[model samples]
Structure formats: structure tokens, C-alpha cells
Target: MARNRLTESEMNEALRALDGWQKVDGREAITRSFKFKDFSTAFGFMAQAALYAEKLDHHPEWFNAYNRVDVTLATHSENGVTELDIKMARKMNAIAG
Candidate 1:
């Protein structure tokens, strides 16, 4: 997990293939939200995600209600996005289905 901040050009270049992730305005974070089939599925997604977060020690700023989950990825120490966010975002994208 890269703890360093990702510059704008660097972020833009990496974002090209990171579908559903978007740069957050007024901040140095990246965000993505996903809607699952139902409440149970959403919970399953949460349960699945926690394992990764716990192990990586990198967790998303998450907000979930019913079938929707909003995730914000930023390296709090650097106050910006990082390679860890990109990798975590990719994991979210993969598990979204």
C-alpha cells in the first residue's frame, strides 16, 4: 500500500481504467458508489469487504444504507489519494457484481 499522495496527472492517468471511480471536488479523495441487488446482497458485500480492509489495514470511508454503499478512498496520513486507493477501488469494482 502506497501511503504517498498521488498527483493530479498521476491520478488522471491511473483513473483511465478505473471505471466508476471519480475525483472528489474540493478534496484530494476519490469516490465510488455501488448499488447491489438487495439489502442482503449489500450486507454480503460489506462482509466481504471487511476482510480485505482488516488485512490490508486500509479501509474505505464507507457509508451504507439499504442497498447502496458509498466509498471514499484517501490516504488520511497524506490527505490524498494513493496507489492503495486505486488497488482498493479495483477490488470494489470487481466485487460489485
Candidate 2:
């Protein structure tokens, strides 16, 4: 299916579903920081997330520091929020949790 941009109300609903996700300051992207119990756990999570990203062909702009993984999801083609991003966020949350 085509990636669909999210409306304001839809954004709110996604935020509610994704408690850890937030709109990046001064930017169109949304972000979330996932904290793991240790460095190995963090890397393990990234490994799984990598597979998901590859499968969807929708990668995230992210950073990792020890036990933390901070991710930003946005559809460059759409130049804004989209279902791809939201679905990815939800998947990440499930994986991280």
C-alpha cells in the first residue's frame, strides 16, 4: 500500500499508542529513545530492528549509545509523517519492550 501522511488527530492517536515517541523539536520528524538493560541488549534490539527496516525498506535516522537507542522515523518521499513511520514506531516499541 502507499504510505499515507498522518493528520493531526491521527498523530495524536499514534502518540497515544506510542507513549515513548515524540515530535522532534523544530523538525517534522518524530523520535523515541529506547533504553535497554545493557549494551548487549541494546545491540540485540538494533539487530532485530535492522531486519525490520530492511524488510520494509524504510530505515530510521538513529543513534546508539551503550544501552540506549534513539530513533527518528519519517518518510523522506512524503516529506512528512506517514503510515510507514507509525508502523515502524509501533514495531520498534514492541521489539524494545
Candidate 3:
């Protein structure tokens, strides 16, 4: 469960620990674009990530285009980033690889 929204600097600090992910400009969400070799690979990544999201109950705002999947993580209830977002982000990174 998300308690409170993270501060801007706090979110930035958290993003630093991740690879290829960045804070959205003028928004509370963090985003990362993953490019796979093909559509099947990209879709597979989304399928696997969805399982983790389901387990965490923290789904991402995502877009899929051919071999690219763009994901944005934020807590809508908190209107910002939270520990849940960061945790899910880490899990997604692991799943993506």
C-alpha cells in the first residue's frame, strides 16, 4: 500500500539507482522505453511484466509499438511516485532482462 508521495528530489534519487529510467517532465511518473529484437520479444516482456504488476497490484501505464514498450510508473492514489512504484520498477527491470 502506498502511504505518501515521494518528493521530487527523492524520486530523482531513486531514479538514479535504476538504469534507462527517468522522471517524466512536469509529471510524477517515471518512464523507461525498452526495445526488444522483435514484436514477439516485446510482447513477451509485457506479458511477464504484467504478472509482476498483478502480484504487486501496481500496474504501469504503458504503450507497445512493434518492438518497443514504454512504461510509466506512478501511484494514481497518491498522485505521485511511491515505494510501490520503485519496487515495481526494479521488478520490471529484472523481468525485462
Candidate 4:
């Protein structure tokens, strides 16, 4: 069954199982950091990721600094983490590649 939302235990499990995702501290979000060769490449990744996020109506909170990008994904409607977050995280990983 799908996790409608992730609890503390599930969050921990997800973080452990995930290759790159990490739980947000004191908040309902999951984060990952991406590194690129340059600012242009970082922005390019963000632009494509934004389109994917928008299409799903599941936006990410992110920041880009030079060659580094940090992203956090969560579904506020559910008020916690969900499968959508995991699925999107996987997509973001692919985006980075």
C-alpha cells in the first residue's frame, strides 16, 4: 500500500533506504543536494526540474549557489511526507544526471 504520509519511523526508513534523500529537520520535507560543473548547468537542472514539479503540482523548495543546488520536496496538502515525495526525489536524481 502507498504511504499516505510518512511518519517518523517511515521517514527514517526512507532516509536509510534512499541513496541521496535526507529528512528535513523540524519540518515536513525531504532534501537532497546536487553538484554541477557550473552555474549554468545547475540552473539548467533546476529549470527542467521545475517543469516536472509544476506538471505534477508538486513544487520543490530549492536554492542554487554557483555549482551547488539544494532541493526539498514535500506535499503540504497531506501535511507530511508521501510517496509523491519519494517519486519526485527519484525524478530529481535523474534530473541531476
Candidate 5:
């Protein structure tokens, strides 16, 4: 449950190990889009990720449409990306994939 904001260099290094996630333009958030087999699966994916988010006491800003979900993660308290956001990205990638 680390909350320290990641430095620019630290963010770049972390992104290298993550797949699909990318920086949001003019924002300190990192975002990724997911596509599922169908609406049911898409909603299921969100439900699954929701559990993890609750456990960590962290949340993502996300949008859903039919079979797609787009997520943006940032530590609002820190006003930037942090280890928690990166960890959430990893869990999300696993869940979505």
C-alpha cells in the first residue's frame, strides 16, 4: 500500500514492464482499454476488478460500452501516478487478459 508519487524516470521504468497501459495526454494518469468477448464478459471483468480495487482502497476512473472498458488510474490524493496505480494496472492486465 505505497502512496509515494512516482518520479518521471520511475514512471517510465515502470511502464516498460506493463503492457497496453499508456500515459494520458496532459494528465498524470495512466490508461488502458480492454475488450472482452461480449457484454457479459465485459461486465464480469469490471466486477472482478472492482473486488481488487476495494481491497486496496484504490479506485479507477473507467468507462464501459458493450464489450469494451477503458480505465484510467491515478492517485488523486497524490495528484499523480504511484506504486498503487501501477500495481492496479498489473492486476487489471491479468484480469482482462
Candidate 6:
């Protein structure tokens, strides 16, 4: 299900397919961090990501510093990892690239 919680096997597969993303310790989200060449590039990634997120009507839980952006993604309605998070993770990776 698109918004449903991922099963163990589903999660394992998602982890393998995604680069740098990991499961959170005390929550039901997936996390990853990206460090760019500089803050400007980092900001650019965020700007692009935010527009994409708005398109999906999905937002990432994130933190940003000078050249790094840390992200956590989950479907709050389902209270766990979902297809939306997977899509967001993939998009972030592409944006950072």
C-alpha cells in the first residue's frame, strides 16, 4: 500500500535500493544526510527539493547546516515508512546529484 507501514522485508528492500538512507533508532522514519560542495549548492538542492515536495504534497523532516542536509522521511498518517518516503529519498538523491 502506498501509505501503509512497510513490512520487514519491504524495509530491507527499500534500504538496499536507496543510497545512504537508514532506519531511525527510536522512530518509524528513514534518514539520510547529504553534504554538498558549499552552502549555496546545499541551498539549491533544498530549493529544488521543496518544489518537488510540494508537487508530491509530501515534505521531508530535515535539518540543514553550512553544507549538509540531514533528512528523515515517513508517512505520519501511517506512522511509518511508506512509498512516499521512498520517492522523497530518491528525489533527494537525484537533487543532490
Which candidate number has the best lDDT? Answer: 5
Candidate 1 ranges with C-alpha deviation above 4 Å: none
Residue-level lDDT of model 5, residues 2-94, one tens digit each, is 678988778888988889988888889899999888999999999999999998899999999999999999998899999989989999988
| Tens-digit lDDT track of model 2 for 1-97 | 7677777667767788887999877667789999889999999999988999999999999999999899998899988888888889988988888
lDDT of 1 by residue, 1-97 (tens): 4578999989988888899888988889888888888889898888888877886788889999999999998888778888888888888887786
Query: Cα deviation in Å at residue 59, candidate 4?
Result: 0.1
30-73 per-residue lDDT for model 3 (tens digits): 99999999999999889988888888888999999999999999
lDDT of 6 by residue, 27-49 (tens): 78899989899999999999999
CA lDDT, candidate 3, residue 54 = 88
Off by over 4 Å in 2: none
In order, candidate lDDTs are: 0.85, 0.87, 0.90, 0.85, 0.91, 0.89
Colliding pairs, model 1:
none
Candidate 6, lDDT over the whole model: 0.89
Report clash pairs, candidate 3. Answer: none
Clashes of each: 0, 0, 0, 0, 0, 0
Q: What TM-score does candidate 1 get on C-alpha atoms?
A: 0.92
Superposed by TM-score, candidate 4 places the C-alpha of residue 3 at a distance from the truth, in angstroms, of 7.1
Better of 2 and 6 by TM-score: 6
Residue pairs whose backbone atoms clash in candidate 2: none
**Distance (Å) between predicted and true CA of 77, model 3?**
0.9
Candidate 4 has its poorest 10 consecutive residues by lDDT at 11-20
TM-score of each: 0.92, 0.92, 0.94, 0.86, 0.94, 0.93
